From Swiss-Prot:
Subcellular location: Nucleus; Golgi apparatus, Golgi stack; Chromosome; Cytoplasm, Cytoskeleton, Microtubule organizing center, Centrosome
Protein task: Reduces the ATPase activity of VCP. Necessary for the fragmentation of Golgi stacks during mitosis and for VCP-mediated reassembly of Golgi stacks after mitosis. May play a role in VCP-mediated formation of transitional endoplasmic reticulum (tER). Inhibits the activity of CTSL (in vitro). Together with UBXN2B/p37, regulates the centrosomal levels of kinase AURKA/Aurora A during mitotic progression by promoting AURKA removal from centrosomes in prophase. Also, regulates spindle orientation during mitosis.
Known partners and oligomeric status: Part of a ternary complex containing STX5A, NSFL1C and VCP. NSFL1C forms a homotrimer that binds to one end of a VCP homohexamer. The complex binds to membranes enriched in phosphatidylethanolamine-containing lipids and promotes Golgi membrane fusion. Interaction with VCIP135 leads to dissociation of the complex via ATP hydrolysis by VCP. Binds ubiquitin and mono-ubiquitinated proteins via its N-terminal UBA-like domain when bound to VCP.
This protein's encoding gene: Nsfl1c
Name this protein carries in UniProt: NSFL1 cofactor p47
Transmembrane segments: none
Amino acid sequence: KASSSILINEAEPTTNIQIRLADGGRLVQKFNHSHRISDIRLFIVDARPAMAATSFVLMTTFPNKELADENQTLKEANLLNAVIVQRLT
């Protein structure tokens, strides 16, 4: 499968993780509460031609915890903070 456009209905709230490359990069990632980062795997492969496997990672600054998730929904990770911070290096 492959969404490449997985977004929640404007009628529902969504989480948005914004990553910023160090070499002037910018990518907005919007995830849902009952979604699943397992889908993120298809997102990167959907438009990660420049990274081609680059060291990037995101973390929640609210609970100062590192994301994780597994495969079920997306908020079940307990990190559903609505706004996550990704750092691409």
